[PDB]
């Protein structure tokens, strides 16, 4: 019943350690019913941010969750998407990749 979509993300790579700060523009969302999810076919981490970090329903400032394997050798690109909490529906995904160290 409502549109869920990411229009862009200020960064495309980042260290697997996680905790990095990112900015993302999206279509109108509800600060009290929204979440950013990073994932693969086997894993799935939820980004960290407060309802106060959801600027006018069209942007969210969060911190990338740390990757499953904090000891990677090669980079690992994962999916990033918005997901409502009322009905868990997700939006299309955008590419973000984790880096070694």
């Amino acid at each position: 019943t409502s549109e869920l979509r990411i229009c862009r993300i200020n960064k495309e790579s980042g260290p697997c350690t996680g905790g990095e700060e990112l900015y993302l523009l999206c279509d109108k969302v509800q600060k009290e019913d929204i979440s950013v999810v990073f994932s693969t076919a086997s894993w799935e981490g939820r980004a960290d941010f407060s309802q106060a970090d959801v600027h006018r329903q069209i942007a969210i400032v969060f911190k990338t969750p740390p990757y499953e394997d904090l000891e990677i050798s090669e980079p690992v690109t994962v999916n990033v998407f918005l997901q409502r909490l009322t009905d868990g529906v997700c939006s299309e995904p955008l590419p973000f990749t984790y880096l070694p160290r």
Partner: protein, 107 residues
């Protein structure tokens, strides 16, 4: 009417060569009537503008642009300037914020 305000800012420093992409969150702006101005209120009177198309003005509350180069390219220490949202129609502004230009590191 609506007062211009800069809520948050992706990053607040970049090379003197400028062009660094910045995500800026703000209060209700109008894709065409708005602009981002860098300047130094000293005697000189320098001023430049953030590079961005009406497309980079996300749903009236955010602006993705690229910092303009500083007027002096051979600076030695981190020069700090101000930037402010400004309307084309009125000339109005927002309480400016700061931005630092780091010296073009060697290579």
């Amino acid at each position: 009417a609506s007062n211009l305000k800069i809520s948050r800012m992706d990053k607040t420093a970049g090379s003197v060569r400028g062009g660094d992409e910045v995500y800026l969150l703000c209060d209700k702006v109008q894709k065409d009537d708005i602009e981002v101005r860098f300047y130094e209120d000293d005697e000189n009177g320098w001023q430049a503008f953030g590079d961005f198309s009406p497309t980079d003005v996300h749903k009236q509350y955010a602006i993705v642009f690229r910092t303009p180069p500083y007027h002096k390219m051979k600076i030695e220490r981190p020069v700090t300037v101000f930037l402010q949202l400004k309307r084309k129609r009125g000339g109005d502004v927002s309480d400016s914020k700061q931005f630092t230009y780091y010296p073009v590191v060697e290579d």
